[PDB]
Amino acid sequence: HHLVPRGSYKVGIWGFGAMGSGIAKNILSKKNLKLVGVHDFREEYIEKDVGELLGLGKIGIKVYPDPITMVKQTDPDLVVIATNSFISVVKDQIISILKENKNVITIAEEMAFPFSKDPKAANEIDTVAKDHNVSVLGTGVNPGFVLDTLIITLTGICLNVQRIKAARINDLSPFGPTVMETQGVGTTPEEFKQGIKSGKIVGHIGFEQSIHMIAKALGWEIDRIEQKREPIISNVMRETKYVKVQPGMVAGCNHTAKAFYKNELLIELEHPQQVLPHLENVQTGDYITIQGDPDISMINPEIPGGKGTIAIATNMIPSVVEARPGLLTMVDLPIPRALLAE
Amino acid sequence: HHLVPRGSYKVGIWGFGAMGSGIAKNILSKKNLKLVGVHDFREEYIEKDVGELLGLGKIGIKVYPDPITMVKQTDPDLVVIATNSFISVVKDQIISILKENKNVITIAEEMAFPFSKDPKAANEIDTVAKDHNVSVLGTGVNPGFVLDTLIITLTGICLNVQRIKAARINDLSPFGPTVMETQGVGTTPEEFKQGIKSGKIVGHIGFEQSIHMIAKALGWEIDRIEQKREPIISNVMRETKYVKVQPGMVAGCNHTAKAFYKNELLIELEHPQQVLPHLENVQTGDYITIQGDPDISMINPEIPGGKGTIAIATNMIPSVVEARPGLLTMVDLPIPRALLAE
Ligand SMILES: NC(=O)c1ccc[n+]([C@@H]2O[C@H](COP(=O)([O-])OP(=O)(O)OC[C@H]3O[C@@H](n4cnc5c(N)ncnc54)[C@H](O)[C@@H]3O)[C@@H](O)[C@H]2O)c1
Numbered sequence: 001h002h003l004v005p006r007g008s009y010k011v012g013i014w015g016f017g018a019m020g021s022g023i024a025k026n027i028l029s030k031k032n033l034k035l036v037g038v039h040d041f042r043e044e045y046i047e048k049d050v051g052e053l054l055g056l057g058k059i060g061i062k063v064y065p066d067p068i069t070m071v072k073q074t075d076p077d078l079v080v081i082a083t084n085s086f087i088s089v090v091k092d093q094i095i096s097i098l099k100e101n102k103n104v105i106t107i108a109e110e111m112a113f114p115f116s117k118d119p120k121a122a123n124e125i126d127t128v129a130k131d132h133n134v135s136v137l138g139t140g141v142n143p144g145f146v147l148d149t150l151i152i153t154l155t156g157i158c159l160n161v162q163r164i165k166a167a168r169i170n171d172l173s174p175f176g177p178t179v180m181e182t183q184g185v186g187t188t189p190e191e192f193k194q195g196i197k198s199g200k201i202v203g204h205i206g207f208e209q210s211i212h213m214i215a216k217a218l219g220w221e222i223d224r225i226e227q228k229r230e231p232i233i234s235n236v237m238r239e240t241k242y243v244k245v246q247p248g249m250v251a252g253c254n255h256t257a258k259a260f261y262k263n264e265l266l267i268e269l270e271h272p273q274q275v276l277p278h279l280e281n282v283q284t285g286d287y288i289t290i291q292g293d294p295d296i297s298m299i300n301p302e303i304p305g306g307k308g309t310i311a312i313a314t315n316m317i318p319s320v321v322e323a324r325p326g327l328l329t330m331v332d333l334p335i336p337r338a339l340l341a342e
Numbered sequence: 343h344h345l346v347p348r349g350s351y352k353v354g355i356w357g358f359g360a361m362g363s364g365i366a367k368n369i370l371s372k373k374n375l376k377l378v379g380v381h382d383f384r385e386e387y388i389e390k391d392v393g394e395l396l397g398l399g400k401i402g403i404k405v406y407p408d409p410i411t412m413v414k415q416t417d418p419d420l421v422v423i424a425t426n427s428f429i430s431v432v433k434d435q436i437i438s439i440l441k442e443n444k445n446v447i448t449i450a451e452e453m454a455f456p457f458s459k460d461p462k463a464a465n466e467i468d469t470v471a472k473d474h475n476v477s478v479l480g481t482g483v484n485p486g487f488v489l490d491t492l493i494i495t496l497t498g499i500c501l502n503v504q505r506i507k508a509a510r511i512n513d514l515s516p517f518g519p520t521v522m523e524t525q526g527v528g529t530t531p532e533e534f535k536q537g538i539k540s541g542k543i544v545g546h547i548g549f550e551q552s553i554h555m556i557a558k559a560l561g562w563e564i565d566r567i568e569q570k571r572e573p574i575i576s577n578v579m580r581e582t583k584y585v586k587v588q589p590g591m592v593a594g595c596n597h598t599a600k601a602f603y604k605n606e607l608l609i610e611l612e613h614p615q616q617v618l619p620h621l622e623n624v625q626t627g628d629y630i631t632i633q634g635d636p637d638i639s640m641i642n643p644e645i646p647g648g649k650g651t652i653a654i655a656t657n658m659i660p661s662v663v664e665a666r667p668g669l670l671t672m673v674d675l676p677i678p679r680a681l682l683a684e
């Protein structure tokens with residue numbers, strides 16, 4: 001009732017890495033968004049022109065050494081935070097922006113649905129947001145879309161849902177050595193085991209967030225989540241510039257999650273990640289099965305993680321600016337849609 | 343800012359046919375909805391107990407001969423109108439409810455997005471809704487989901503969209519003689535031609551609504567829509583209790599639509615409807631292709647029209663009750679999701 005609608009929105013960015021620089025380039029293309037400032041803590045970006053960093057020539061938008069200075073001088077309506085995955089780090093970044101009376105989108109995986117896993121941090125964020133009449137959303141391809149929002153959306157044509165099973169199968173081949181390491185690519189089984197114990201081999205971050213969003217959306221409770229991270233052993237040679245997988249070595253990580261209530265399995269999410277999956281007849285894609293009334297079976301190849309994340313983080317901007325105050329989720333907002341290029 | 347949120351919602355129904363009786367049964371199953379009244383103009387329903395009509399025993403909810411009496415005595419928060427397809431008929435039904443200060447959902451095909459095709463009727467509805475601080479939504483499987491909402495949602499992971507192509511392929515075999523007639527099943531080509539001219543053979547109602555919703559959502563303009571309705575000629579026998587199709591006869595209707603702007607094709611929607619499509623290797627399903635950055639290719643079998651429509655019309659109820667006043671569309675509301683059974 002009191003919302004003043006706007007026709008264009010100013011955007012700032014905190015974190016000018018792969019995602020945040022993609023986002024900046026995407027915003028620059030939009031008719032109804034304007035990029036007004038960027039911040040990153042690395043000297044290689046600080047005080048440089050964002051246009052020139054992106055290879056577009058000078059556009060007169062600089063990278064600020066400080067995010068609060070950025071916000072105060074450039075006056076964005078919303079800041080996109082593309083920094084870290086973990087609510088223990090990102091919470092203070094989010095709160096810093098909300099205290100300067102701006103909205104936030106983050107792609108941090110633990111922010112897609114933090115209410116069950118990190119209830120104190122969630123409440124702290126929601127409270128600051130409400131106290132400053134601003135909104136926060138965590139989004140992304142996964143978590144934020146393929147294994148949560150999209151699943152939920154499909155249930156909208158169901159009379160009732162019994163259980164969900166979904167899988168995202170990607171190809172790690174495009175990526176660099178850090179990604180290869182986090183999925184154990186190019187390891188022996190023993191090496192993989194020790195990387196899992198040490199945390200060097202991560203698998204996927206977000207299944208708990210997606211499970212809890214789906215559950216909340218459908219009115220279910222979840223009392224237990226079992227996760228497994230198992231090496232994907234190759235029978236063939238798989239090689240990129242940065243990794244060599246021989247037969248018997250690990251080609252990546254099969255991370256799966258099962259969510260229960262009182263020992264009834266309600267949600268099963270699977271995310272095998274490996275290099276060159278087609279070499280052993282694995283087809284990449286996003287696959288959703290809903291068992292209910294009716295049953296639904298649904299994308300090949302899979303939605304690209306990087307490009308899709310850049311996209312959705314951009315595309316949600318107007319909705320978040322226009323949204324009610326608080327810590328919001330994708331389930332609270334109008335359906336995602338692509339914003340018009342200039 | 344002024345919205346008082348509710349935890350349960352009372353529902354009324356106008357039109358107790360295949361959809362409206364399905365909807366009533368679905369609402370009766372929900373934890374957070376209560377069915378409070380039904381109206382239909384046929385004597386066979388009027389004054390009968392809805393529970394008994396549905397085979398559930400007496401539940402003490404009757405069918406009213408008058409919808410306004412229904413609303414005044416049973417005090418629903420929202421009325422679902424499942425009567426007719428055409429905005430020329432349904433507009434006055436919708437307006438009648440809005441003037442009694444209640445919200446509306448309708449499944450009328452021309453109400454999914456009436457702003458371009460029927461701008462005077464749309465504005466009249468939007469104006470009455472706003473004047474009475476209530477909301478109206480048109481929804482359904484098609485239009486309302488598969489060839490509009492769902493497509494739009496998928497674009498939310500795109501950087502930009504060039505063009506869309508989508509098809510829904512169903513099987514008419516389950517249906518009765520009226521459906522068979524509207525799709526020309528069991529006709530000769532000459533007969534089909536004359537049924538198209540007379541309006542006995544309809545094809546699909548809604549492509550213009552879906553095209554215009556997708557366009558509006560993406561910020562596109564459409565200046566021309568070309569439609570074709572061509573008979574699907576069988577090479578084999580196809581038979582149900584109510585129809586016999588011999589080789590050379592028509593098995594149904596291939597209705598397609600192409601939407602342009604300045605002669606560039608932006609949206610192509612296809613809905614072949616025929617009996618027993620598998621007999622000539624046609625696979626039923628809903629298929630969406632987005633050409634853009636990135637390209638996206640997406641359900642087999644197709645989302646069931648009847649069950650899915652019952653579902654979505656029910657599932658949107660809380661959102662519409664909670665929504666801002668006016669004539670809304672699926673693009674304005676939170677993502678569809680299944681409501682919890684009691
Ligand atoms: N939800 C999803 O689907 C999704 C998808 C992609 C990435 N992510 C997450 O988004 C984050 C960003 O991914 P990326 O690929 O852009 O990573 P990146 O390493 O390429 O970029 C991170 C950037 O943030 C900067 N940065 C980090 N901490 C900072 C701080 N405290 N202050 C200022 N600048 C800081 C770094 O200097 C770097 O430029 C990661 O946590 C990633 O896992 C989520």
Ligand SMILES: NC(=O)c1ccc[n+]([C@@H]2O[C@H](COP(=O)([O-])OP(=O)(O)OC[C@H]3O[C@@H](n4cnc5c(N)ncnc54)[C@H](O)[C@@H]3O)[C@@H](O)[C@H]2O)c1
Pocket residue numbers: 356357358359360361362381382383384424425426427428449450451481482483484485486647648651
């Ligand atoms: N958007 C979609 O995907 C979608 C899907 C299914 C049906 N529909 C539409 O929904 C409508 C209902 O479909 P159905 O299969 O239930 O049709 P139906 O013929 O089985 O039921 C219509 C009912 O409405 C009653 N009725 C009609 N006009 C009335 C009036 N003026 N006052 C009171 N009662 C009245 C009839 O007596 C009948 O019981 C149709 O127009 C149909 O095309 C849309």
